[PDB]
Design a protein around this motif. Structure first.
Motif, short mmCIF file in Angstrom:
data_model
loop_
_atom_site.label_atom_id
_atom_site.label_comp_id
_atom_site.label_asym_id
_atom_site.label_seq_id
_atom_site.Cartn_x
_atom_site.Cartn_y
_atom_site.Cartn_z
N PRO A 153 13.58 100.22 -57.12
CA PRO A 153 13.13 99.22 -56.16
C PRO A 153 11.69 99.45 -55.68
CG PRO A 153 15.31 100.08 -55.55
CD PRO A 153 14.75 100.97 -56.63
N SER A 154 11.17 100.66 -55.87
CA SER A 154 9.83 101.11 -55.40
C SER A 154 8.70 100.61 -56.30
CB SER A 154 9.81 102.60 -55.29
OG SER A 154 10.82 103.03 -54.40
N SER A 155 9.05 100.08 -57.49
CA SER A 155 8.11 99.73 -58.60
C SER A 155 8.31 98.29 -59.09
CB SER A 155 8.31 100.70 -59.75
OG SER A 155 8.00 102.02 -59.36
N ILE A 156 8.91 97.40 -58.31
CA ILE A 156 9.13 95.97 -58.69
C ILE A 156 7.90 95.16 -58.29
CG2 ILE A 156 10.49 93.88 -58.21
CD1 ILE A 156 12.98 95.70 -58.02
N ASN A 157 7.39 95.36 -57.07
CA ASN A 157 6.35 94.50 -56.44
C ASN A 157 4.99 95.20 -56.50
OD1 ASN A 157 8.73 93.82 -53.85
ND2 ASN A 157 8.39 92.58 -55.68
N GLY A 158 4.99 96.52 -56.45
CA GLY A 158 3.76 97.33 -56.46
C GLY A 158 3.01 97.22 -55.15
N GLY A 159 2.04 98.09 -54.93
CA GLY A 159 1.17 98.08 -53.73
C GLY A 159 0.93 99.48 -53.20
N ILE A 160 -0.16 99.67 -52.46
CA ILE A 160 -0.55 100.97 -51.84
C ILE A 160 -1.00 100.77 -50.39
CG2 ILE A 160 -1.02 102.21 -53.95
CD1 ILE A 160 -3.96 101.39 -53.68
N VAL A 161 -0.96 101.87 -49.63
CA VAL A 161 -1.53 102.03 -48.26
C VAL A 161 -2.08 103.46 -48.18
CG1 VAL A 161 -0.95 102.26 -45.80
CG2 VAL A 161 -0.04 100.33 -47.12
N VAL A 162 -3.23 103.62 -47.52
CA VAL A 162 -3.81 104.94 -47.14
C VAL A 162 -4.29 104.84 -45.69
CG1 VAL A 162 -5.86 104.22 -48.44
CG2 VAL A 162 -5.69 106.60 -47.66
N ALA A 163 -4.30 105.96 -44.97
CA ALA A 163 -4.86 106.08 -43.61
C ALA A 163 -5.61 107.41 -43.51
CB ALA A 163 -3.78 105.95 -42.56
N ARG A 174 -1.87 93.10 -53.70
CA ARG A 174 -1.06 92.64 -54.85
C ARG A 174 0.40 92.50 -54.41
NH1 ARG A 174 1.99 94.43 -59.16
NH2 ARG A 174 1.86 93.02 -60.94
N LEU A 175 1.02 91.39 -54.78
CA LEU A 175 2.49 91.20 -54.81
C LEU A 175 2.82 90.72 -56.22
CD1 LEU A 175 5.18 89.23 -54.34
CD2 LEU A 175 5.03 91.49 -53.30
N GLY A 176 3.58 91.54 -56.95
CA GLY A 176 3.93 91.28 -58.36
C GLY A 176 5.42 91.26 -58.53
N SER A 177 5.88 90.77 -59.67
CA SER A 177 7.27 90.94 -60.15
C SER A 177 7.20 91.58 -61.54
CB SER A 177 8.01 89.64 -60.15
OG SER A 177 9.35 89.86 -60.54
N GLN A 178 7.14 92.92 -61.57
CA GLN A 178 6.91 93.74 -62.80
C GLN A 178 5.47 93.48 -63.27
OE1 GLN A 178 9.56 95.84 -62.86
NE2 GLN A 178 10.97 94.98 -64.38
N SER A 179 5.29 92.97 -64.49
CA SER A 179 3.95 92.73 -65.09
C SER A 179 3.27 91.52 -64.44
CB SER A 179 4.09 92.57 -66.57
OG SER A 179 5.26 91.82 -66.85
N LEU A 180 4.05 90.47 -64.13
CA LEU A 180 3.56 89.19 -63.54
C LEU A 180 3.05 89.42 -62.12
CD1 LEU A 180 3.24 86.13 -63.41
CD2 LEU A 180 5.65 85.95 -62.81
N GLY A 181 1.74 89.31 -61.90
CA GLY A 181 1.16 89.14 -60.55
C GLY A 181 1.55 87.79 -59.96
N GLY A 207 6.31 99.33 -50.88
CA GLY A 207 7.65 99.36 -51.51
C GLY A 207 8.16 97.96 -51.81
N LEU A 208 9.50 97.81 -51.88
CA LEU A 208 10.21 96.52 -52.08
C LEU A 208 9.74 95.52 -51.01
CD1 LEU A 208 12.32 95.40 -53.97
CD2 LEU A 208 14.09 96.07 -52.36
N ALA A 209 9.17 94.37 -51.41
CA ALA A 209 8.38 93.48 -50.50
C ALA A 209 9.27 92.85 -49.42
CB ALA A 209 7.65 92.43 -51.29
N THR A 210 10.52 92.47 -49.75
CA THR A 210 11.55 91.93 -48.81
C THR A 210 11.71 92.88 -47.62
OG1 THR A 210 13.83 91.11 -48.56
CG2 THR A 210 13.54 92.87 -50.12
#
Ligand SMILES: *C(=O)[C@H]1NC[C@@](C)(O)[C@](O)([C@H](CC2CCCCC2)NC(=O)[C@H](Cc2ccc(OC)cc2)NC(=O)[C@H](CCO)NC(=O)CN2CCOCC2)O[C@@H]1C
Ligand SMILES: [Mg+2]
Ligand SMILES: [Mg+2]
Ligand SMILES: [Mg+2]
Lengths: 241, 244, 242, 204, 250, 198, 211, 233
Positions: free
Chosen positions: D3-13, D27-34, D54-57
């Protein structure tokens, strides 16, 4: 936990809590419904003991249940909200499973069944509420008007009134409503409703609302002036004599 | 068994009234007076603190004016403890509406739900009603400024100006006298105090016996502000209106 | 007050006795059983002339071979009829046959005593007895044509004929004489209409009085107002004869 | 699957001299499809900022949930929740669904209104707190962010210098991850004012 | 069996009184005098240890109780009611706050939580109200020192200083004279010992008086060292010895 | 999967939805409307598991229709989307989740602006100028990335779909039996009845 | 193998009569049509018990609707009770493919395909079961709206015979129904045993078989 | 006195009585007469049925509980339905689980313990009916008398209902005669009819009025009504 029997039989065969629920309805502001040839009209009096209100946001007496059925009431206002919400949910439930809006008889029969249940369930008192339920069946042009009372009994009416001084305005309607020729117009149907209220309201421009329900989900509440016109014509009918 | 000791709090009189409701209304008639006045450009809430001492900390004190939302407030008249139970479930309904729809709760919706809760304690469960009357002052983008009132019976109505608690008959006459529809917030504040000043069961109306709130739309923003007036700010506005 | 399921010193359940009083204040209902069918008649008794009389449903169909008439607090009958219908259809589902009139009645009477405040037995969650009596009438292959009286006590008697409601003790004394084992359906129709006319406050016409029957061939049929009107006219001319 | 790799994305502080920064990709993706190039991962409740990877939901649901909780917090306490306290609320909230967790990697950032002390923290999906002074990383390119931050970062950076360092860390990490990028935003946070900046980055 | 008391034992009377709540205040009036004073840099709560018998060990009965390391409570009325209220109060400070936000609740909120439990006993089926009034003294970073009063109804109010129980009417009058907004904590322990001398019939010493302060952090009462942020509890009950030293300067 | 397309233009939202319903080896129906009207200015298209698809649609519909009568008022498209997202996000952690993806196209009469929401069965919601569900997006997003402009008329919007449907009729393996096209604007919802050769 | 199609003259309903347990032939003399009321037919394909039990239970629920509302139940509302029932058992392994075929004045002649997946579809032409494709083949290439009752009956019969012949898991006999304003009429049981040779001769079709 | 201690079954009187139970006992005396008696081989139930009108049926007083057991009622019929139903289940549970005909003695103990629970808990009410149970088990012919107080008694013969004392004084006298009617069912029934007719007054027992049941050595519990009982009038 609390299942104490509050509605019980007394020695003379009477359910006093159901009896006393009707007394709360007598105390309620008057409401009337007269069905024409092609329409039904709901007319409800507004009290005058406290006047400095907001008429935009204060909950008005006629409630829409679906787009084709409406419900006026006399009795405890807070009790009426619980019946309306239950009826509005049964409206959507019925569409969902039957793929068709409720008939006026069905919606009435449901509201009547709820009132009845609260007369033989532990821990609860009967509703201090009678209802007029009016509207038209789906794809039907025959006008419908029904009454429920706290006991749970229901039945249809050419015309009827409930609440304070309903005695007086029932007498009026009983000698001013001909079953042979029901008010053929929307106009003359609204006229007989306002006339019947003016027996009880005692000079009431901003003390009388009217709602007109026609077939195919065509419901409209009248503004002050529209009603104010019908009052001005009816008082010239008396004086010209 | 237990039947012997059951008051039966949810029954009808022979006349068709609800004993426990009527008696709760009696309870609320002895509580400090609270006033709502709605103007064109905002809403005023004023209330009088029943009983005070030299030693009652007035700074850390809130008994009559509570924030339900950022757009809605209530003035209380009745049992403080009973009010806090209802205020707390009202604050939750407002957040459950914001979480579900991503819009702030319309005022009538919140007021209906609180009135519905009270109505319950009136028809089932065998418990006493809540000895509480609310004035709700709120703004939403459907009806703008709205002033509602609710009581133990579960019944609610909207108002231009209204009072609850002590001396409502006397207060309602004095508002009905000097209210006009074109009124301004600064006019309303002045009206709210004059009214309390003449229905008070005390010598003078001083700052330490008052709570005050205004819901305005500060012309230098375009958004709705809630001001719950601090002691020094009630003391100011008291000297300006000529009550010193 | 005191318990809702309490015994009087005379060995009777107060709430049940007080219930039978409500039933004496109700509109009349009459039943007559013959070898050609069972007839149910009721007094409509509209409280106002503005009340549309044929919205008054005091004779209901339970199944094609069973119908029932009521008297008392008629609103209390709704959930009884619901239970009668569900039972008759549910019997048909489990055995591919028609439920016996007697067994149907026994199922309705099994609700009657399910009242209390947690009475040590099962789980009777219903504050008070029913304020209504039923005349259940039907036909089956086993016991032929049948009329049953179902009280809120839970007892139910079979009658050759029975009246309930305001006019009952008067009407019953009349049925005692008039009923014989070789009545026709037509005779029993005139006889119900006749006894209603006697014990009704209002003058009996086709608007404030409703007939019905149950025959093996045609099942349970409420008579429309025109058919009843012709039977009132027929009665009057037979009474005017002698 | 993961579930951690379906939508993709990062945060840093990152923390600096009397300031903190928190940045995220869009980025909000569904696997390869942005699917969306506008999906922001950094919310705020008062002066306390929360990033969620993580999982966008779940990202959406937790933001709604901490808005709900911080709102009632303000009504009762009659003040704005502080970073240190908000951290614990996030931790206890995540641990409460220990056997059905939210598939997220949250990151708190803000300045204490009473002490003036810059504060950051991150959390695993069941609410284990990680409270480093230096920097916090989260999402599909965490590994990359760890190596950019560890190499680029020094203590006591002024806001304008910090902005460069967190921007170069995020950018250069996202361009080595298939499931991150498609734009980024950076929040520079000081005691008084807060500046939000959208970055220009590779659109592949 | 089974609690069949699912209905309120506290109902409105035609006069609009709640019978049981007034009767609870009457029970609180018979109670021993207890008071509270808020200084600029602390709070003091105090009461009398009305020993039932001289064979009884008065020490083994805490009328004054720690709720959290920076909050304390004392009471007038029915001691059993107080004992279970302190038990529920300590446990609600944990479940409804410390287990969520990882810090101890501020005074007003913990007071709010106590008030709520007392209100429910005013309205819940099959119970009587609690026959106590509480005086709760506390400190938290954002509200400083505070002092609250909690009644059988669930109502609570903040006080600079007040008393409850037997000699409250006179104790309140005496606190009005002696209170100012500039008092140091020591000055208020002195005024509390003065105000409590008017209430006590027999012996008046460290063994008949129970008195606690909310004040400065007490690192020596923490139990461990090496975490600088942790400076120890602000609540401190005074010893039999400490009270007597301050009685000789009365 | 089935075809669920949406595209927001200047003054409208256009939803286009495949007419094919296929169990195993037989196309059962060729005229399926994979959309429910939620309110007079909010429309929801849906594709996913056989049963759940309509059951979810009709359930949402009933709830929105209930809200409308109770408040005598129409919820914003933003409000309806947020209600629907939350319903799915519960369903995802329930015993048997609704496997249904939706587009919500609505016209906000308060903002006087059209809005298109795409929401997957997990409760993933996003606002888009154009959206798609299933394999369809693998073709249409790069197409619209090229040919889309935010200031387009409803008429241009429809040519932009005719371009998306041709591309899908060319390159996708399924016969989806063409699309039904609905426009949501200031005047409510109407069905473009001539898309069979427009 | 079951079908129902709509035309000028009402509705045609045709079903095979074979029950299998894998490659074992259990029966050739099975009813696959439930007569719910004089104006409502239900067809059965799938698990034998699942179809029989729940279409019998639908029969009860429809009767209960007549007593309650004093009105014949709509095809829409009948299909939707079975649909909503089945949907509650989804994932549990129920197996049924069914057409609810009936006449009401309000709706006119109406057909609902309902399957154990939850799918509920209105349409003019359905074929359901292991034999569906064989039936569609004949039906789809001869269907007009404007067929005579006689020709529509024949096409329905001829479309079941078709699938009875090719599909190893269909056969026995064809049951025929016609649904009009006046309700359903039963047009008899036709043993594939004798039907095949009568059709092959008369029609000159089935040229693939030696006879 | 009595007025303050008869509200409910959970309240004792100062003399140690339970009035609600005595009131329930009263409903039995108002019930129509029924008789029971047994030899060593058979056990009989003769009940007088009671009609509301001449137009009404004579309400059924005898219920079959298993092939080897049944009971006559007097009092509230709906209570005899609930108690007979519970007996049917216990006779059934004994057959299905242990392949064992339930003993008449143990049927008695089970009725006793069911009636008793209603007399010690608030909200309940005593059963308002008396029952005579006859059975033929492994220890031969048995007759029991059940009382809603929960008291059950094995007897050679007895009678309950209105004027029941006549039949009971006659059986008390005929004891040495009828006990020895072994392998003669027609003579045990005659001595049952001659017992119940000692408690008449109003009318004479007719055809659709009388109800008889028998169980014994090689006779399943079978109920005779109408024409069938014509040869005993
Ligand atoms: C046209 O397409 C026909 N094709 C023939 C057939 C047999 O496959 C079937 O689907 C037919 C449906 C009719 C049969 C007659 C009664 C009305 C329904 N089905 C069967 O005959 C059915 C096959 C079947 C078995 C199992 C499953 O999945 C569970 C699906 C279909 N036969 C049975 O059910 C046999 C009955 C005789 O033994 N019994 C079992 O299979 C028993 N097991 C069932 C599953 O649970 C375990 C027990 O007709 C269509 C229309
Ligand atoms: Mg990348
Ligand atoms: Mg790329
Ligand atoms: Mg084959």
């Amino acid at each position: 936990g609390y299942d104490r029997a509050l509605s019980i039989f007394s020695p003379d065969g009477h359910i006093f809590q159901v009896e006393y629920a009707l007394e709360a309805v007598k105390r309620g502001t008057c409401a009337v419904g007269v069905k024409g040839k092609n329409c039904v009209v709901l007319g409800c009096e507004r009290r005058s003991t406290l006047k400095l209100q907001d008429t935009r946001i204060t909950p008005s007496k006629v409630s829409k249940i679906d787009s084709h059925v409406v419900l006026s009431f006399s009795g405890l206002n807070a009790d009426s909200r619980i019946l309306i919400e239950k009826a509005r949910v049964e409206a959507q439930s019925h569409r969902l499973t039957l793929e068709d809006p409720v008939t006026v008889e069905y919606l009435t029969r449901y509201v009547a069944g709820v009132q009845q249940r609260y007369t033989q369930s532990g821990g609860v008192r009967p509703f201090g509420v009678s209802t007029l339920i009016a509207g038209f069946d789906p794809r039907d042009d025959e006008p419908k008007l029904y009454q429920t009372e706290p006991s749970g009994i229901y039945s249809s009416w050419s015309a009827q009134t409930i609440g304070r001084n309903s005695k007086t305005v029932r007498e009026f309607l009983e000698k001013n409503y001909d079953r042979k020729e029901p008010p053929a117009t929307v106009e003359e149907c609204v006229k007989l409703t306002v006339r019947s209220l003016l027996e009880v309201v005692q000079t009431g421009a901003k003390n009388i609302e009217i709602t007109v329900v026609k077939p195919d989900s065509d419901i409209v509440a009248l503004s002050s002036e529209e009603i104010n016109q019908y009052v001005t014509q009816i008082e010239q009918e008396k004086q010209e004599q | 068994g237990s039947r012997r000791y059951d008051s039966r709090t949810t029954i009808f009189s022979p006349e068709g009234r609800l004993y426990q409701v009527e008696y709760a209304l009696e309870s609320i008639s002895h509580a400090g007076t609270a006033i709502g006045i709605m103007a064109s450009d905002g809403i005023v809430l004023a209330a009088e603190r029943k009983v005070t001492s030299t030693l009652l900390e007035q700074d850390t004190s809130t008994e009559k004016l509570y924030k339900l939302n950022d757009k809605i407030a209530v003035a209380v008249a009745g049992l403080t403890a009973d009010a806090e139970i209802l205020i707390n479930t009202a604050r939750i309904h407002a957040q459950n509406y914001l979480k579900t729809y991503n819009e702030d709760i319309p005022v009538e919706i919140l007021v209906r739900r609180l009135s519905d809760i009270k109505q319950g304690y009136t028809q089932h469960g065998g418990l006493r009603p809540f000895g509480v009357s609310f004035i709700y002052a709120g703004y939403d983008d459907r009806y703008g400024y709205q002033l509602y009132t609710s009581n133990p019976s579960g019944n609610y109505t909207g108002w231009k100006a209204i009072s609850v608690g002590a001396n409502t008959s006397a207060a309602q006459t004095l508002l009905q006298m000097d209210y006009k529809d074109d009124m301004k917030v600064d006019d309303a504040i002045e009206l709210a105090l004059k009214t309390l000043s003449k229905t008070t069961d005390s010598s003078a109306l001083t700052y330490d016996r008052l709570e005050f709130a205004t819901i305005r739309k500060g012309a230098n923003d375009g958004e709705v502000y809630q001001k719950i007036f601090k002691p020094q700010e009630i003391k100011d506005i008291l000297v300006k209106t000529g009550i010193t | 007050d005191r318990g809702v399921s309490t015994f009087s010193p005379e060995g009777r359940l107060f709430q049940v006795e007080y219930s039978l009083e409500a039933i004496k204040l109700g509109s009349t209902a009459i039943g007559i059983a013959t070898k050609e069918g069972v007839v149910l008649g009721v007094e409509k008794r509209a409280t106002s002339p503005l009340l549309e009389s044929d919205s008054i449903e005091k004779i209901v169909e339970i199944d094609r071979h069973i119908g029932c008439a009521m008297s008392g607090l008629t609103a209390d009958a709704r959930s009884m009829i619901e239970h009668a219908r569900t039972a008759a259809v549910t019997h048909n589902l489990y055995y591919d046959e028609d439920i016996n009139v007697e067994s149907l009645t026994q199922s309705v009477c099994d609700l009657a005593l399910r009242f209390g405040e947690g009475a040590s037995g099962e789980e009777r969650l219903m504050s008070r007895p029913f304020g209504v009596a039923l005349l259940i009438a039907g036909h089956d292959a086993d016991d032929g044509y049948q009329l049953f009286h179902a009280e809120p006590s839970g007892t139910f008697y079979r009658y050759n004929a029975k009246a309930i409601g305001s006019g009952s003790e008067g009407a019953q004394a009349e049925l005692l004489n008039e009923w014989h084992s070789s009545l026709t359906l037509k005779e029993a129709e005139l006889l119900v209409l006749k006894i209603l006319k006697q014990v009704m406050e209002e003058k009996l016409d086709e608007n404030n009085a409703q007939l019905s029957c149950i025959t093996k061939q045609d099942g349970f049929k409420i008579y429309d107002n025109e058919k009843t009107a012709e039977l009132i006219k027929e009665l009057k001319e037979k009474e005017a004869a002698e | 699957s993961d579930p951690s790799s379906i939508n993709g994305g990062i945060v840093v502080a990152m923390t600096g001299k009397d300031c903190v920064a928190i940045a995220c990709d869009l980025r909000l993706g569904s696997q390869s499809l942005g699917v969306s190039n506008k999906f922001e991962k950094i919310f705020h409740y008062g002066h306390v900022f929360l990033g969620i990877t993580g999982l966008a939901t779940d990202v959406t649901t937790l933001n709604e949930m901490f808005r709900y909780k911080t709102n009632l917090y303000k009504l009762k306490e009659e003040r704005a929740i502080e970073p240190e306290t908000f951290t614990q609320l996030v931790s206890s909230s995540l641990y409460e669904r220990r056997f059905g967790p939210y598939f997220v990697g949250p990151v708190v950032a803000g300045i204490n209104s009473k002490s003036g002390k810059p504060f950051i923290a991150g959390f695993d999906l069941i609410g284990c707190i990680d409270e480093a002074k230096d920097f916090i990383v989260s999402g599909t390119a965490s590994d990359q962010l760890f190596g950019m931050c560890e190499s680029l970062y020094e203590p006591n950076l002024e806001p304008e210098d910090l902005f460069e360092t967190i921007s170069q860390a995020l950018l250069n990490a996202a361009d080595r991850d298939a499931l991150s990028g498609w734009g980024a935003v950076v929040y520079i946070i000081k005691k008084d004012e807060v500046v939000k900046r959208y970055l220009k980055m590779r659109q592949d | 069996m089974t609690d069949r008391y699912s209905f309120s034992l506290t109902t409105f009377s035609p006069s609009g009184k709640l019978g049981q709540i007034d009767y609870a205040l009457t029970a609180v009036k018979q109670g021993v005098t207890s008071l509270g004073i808020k200084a600029t840099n602390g709070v003091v709560i105090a009461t009398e240890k009305k020993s039932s018998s001289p064979l009884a060990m008065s020490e083994t009965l805490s009328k004054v109780s720690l709720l959290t390391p920076d909050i304390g409570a004392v009471y007038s009325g029915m001691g059993p009611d107080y004992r279970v209220l302190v038990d529920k109060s300590r446990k609600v400070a944990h479940t409804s706050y410390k287990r969520i936000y990882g810090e101890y609740p501020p005074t007003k909120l913990l007071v709010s939580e106590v008030a709520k439990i007392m209100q429910e006993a005013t309205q819940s089926g099959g119970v009587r109200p609690f026959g106590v009034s509480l005086l709760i003294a506390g400190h938290d970073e954002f509200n400083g020192f505070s002092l609250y009063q909690v009644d059988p109804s669930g109502s609570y109010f903040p006080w600079k200083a007040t008393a409850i129980g037997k000699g409250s009417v006179a104790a309140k009058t005496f606190l009005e004279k002696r209170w100012n907004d500039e008092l140091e904590l020591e000055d208020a322990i002195h005024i509390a010992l003065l105000t409590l001398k008017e209430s006590v019939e027999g012996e008046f010493n460290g063994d008949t008086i129970e008195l606690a302060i909310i004040g400065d952090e007490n690192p020596d009462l923490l139990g461990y060292t090496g975490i600088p942020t942790d400076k120890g509890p602000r609540f401190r009950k005074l010893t039999s010895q400490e009270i007597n030293d301050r009685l000789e300067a009365l | 999967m089935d075809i669920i397309l949406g595209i927001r233009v200047q003054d409208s939202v256009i939803l286009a939805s495949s007419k094919a319903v296929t169990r195993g080896i037989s196309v059962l129906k060729d005229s399926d409307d994979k959309t429910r009207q939620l309110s007079p200015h909010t429309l929801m298209s849906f594709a996913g598991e056989a049963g759940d698809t309509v059951q979810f649609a009709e359930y949402i519909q009933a709830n929105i229709q209930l809200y409308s009568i109770r408040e005598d008022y129409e919820l914003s498209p933003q409000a309806v989307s947020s209600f629907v997202r939350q319903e799915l996000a519960k369903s995802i952690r329930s015993r048997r989740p609704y496997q249904v993806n939706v587009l919500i196209g609505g016209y906000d009469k308060k903002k006087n602006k059209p809005e298109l929401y795409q929401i997957d069965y997990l409760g993933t919601k996003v606002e888009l100028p154009y959206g798609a569900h299933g394999y369809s997006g693998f073709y249409t997003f790069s197409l619209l990335d090229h040919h889309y402009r935010p200031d387009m008329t409803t008429e241009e919007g429809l040519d932009l779909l005719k371009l998306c449907v041709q591309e899908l009729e060319k390159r996708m393996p399924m016969d989806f039996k063409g699309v039904i096209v609905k426009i949501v604007d200031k005047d409510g919802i109407r069905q473009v009845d001539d898309f069979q050769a427009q | 193998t079951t079908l129902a199609f709509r035309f000028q003259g009402g509705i045609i309903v045709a079903v095979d009569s074979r029950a299998t347990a894998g490659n074992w032939v259990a029966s050739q003399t099975v009813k696959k049509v439930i007569e719910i009321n004089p104006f409502l037919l239900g067809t059965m394909a799938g698990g034998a018990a699942d179809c029989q039990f729940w279409e019998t239970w639908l029969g009860s629920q429809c009767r209960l609707h007549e007593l309650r509302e004093k009105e014949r139940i709509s095809v829409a509302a009948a299909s939707k009770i079975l649909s909503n029932l089945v949907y509650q058992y989804k994932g549990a392994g129920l197996s049924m493919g069914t057409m609810i075929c009936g006449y009401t004045r309000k709706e006119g002649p109406t057909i609902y395909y309902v399957d154990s997946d939850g799918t509920r579809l209105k349409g003019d032409i359905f074929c359901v079961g292991s034999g569906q494709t064989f039936a569609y083949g004949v039906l789809d290439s001869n269907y007009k709206w404007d067929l005579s009752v006689e020709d529509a009956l024949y096409l329905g019969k001829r479309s079941i015979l078709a699938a009875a012949h090719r599909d190893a898991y269909s056969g026995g006999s064809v049951n025929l129904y016609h649904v009009t304003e006046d309700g359903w009429i039963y047009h008899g049981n036709h043993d594939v045993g004798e039907l095949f040779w009568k059709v092959k001769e008369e029609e000159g079709s089935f040229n693939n078989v030696i006879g | 006195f009595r007025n303050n201690y008869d509200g409910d079954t959970v309240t004792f009187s100062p003399t140690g009585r339970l009035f609600q139970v005595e009131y329930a006992l009263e409903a039995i005396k108002q019930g129509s007469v029924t008789v029971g008696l047994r030899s060593n081989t058979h056990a009989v139930l003769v009940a007088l049925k009671r009609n509301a009108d001449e137009l009404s049926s004579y309400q059924k007083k005898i219920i079959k509980c298993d092939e080897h057991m049944g009971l006559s009622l007097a009092g509230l019929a709906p209570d005899a339905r609930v108690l007979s139903n519970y007996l049917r289940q216990q006779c059934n549970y004994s057959s299905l689980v242990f392949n064992r005909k339930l003993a008449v003695e143990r049927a008695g103990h089970l009725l006793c313990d069911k009636a008793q629970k209603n007399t010690q808990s608030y909200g309940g009410r005593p059963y308002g009916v008396g029952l005579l149970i006859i059975g033929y088990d492994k220890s031969g012919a048995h007759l029991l008398e059940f009382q809603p107080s929960g008291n059950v008694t094995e007897l050679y013969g007895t009678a309950i209902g209105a004027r029941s004392q006549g039949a009971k004084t006659y059986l008390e006298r005929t004891l040495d005669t009828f006990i020895k009617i072994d392998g003669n069912p027609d003579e045990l029934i005659k001595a049952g009819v001659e017992a119940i007719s000692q408690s008449l007054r109003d009318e004479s027992l007719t055809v659709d009025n009388l109800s008889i049941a028998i169980v014994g050595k090689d006779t399943p519990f079978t109920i005779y009504d109408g024409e069938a009982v014509a040869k005993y009038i």
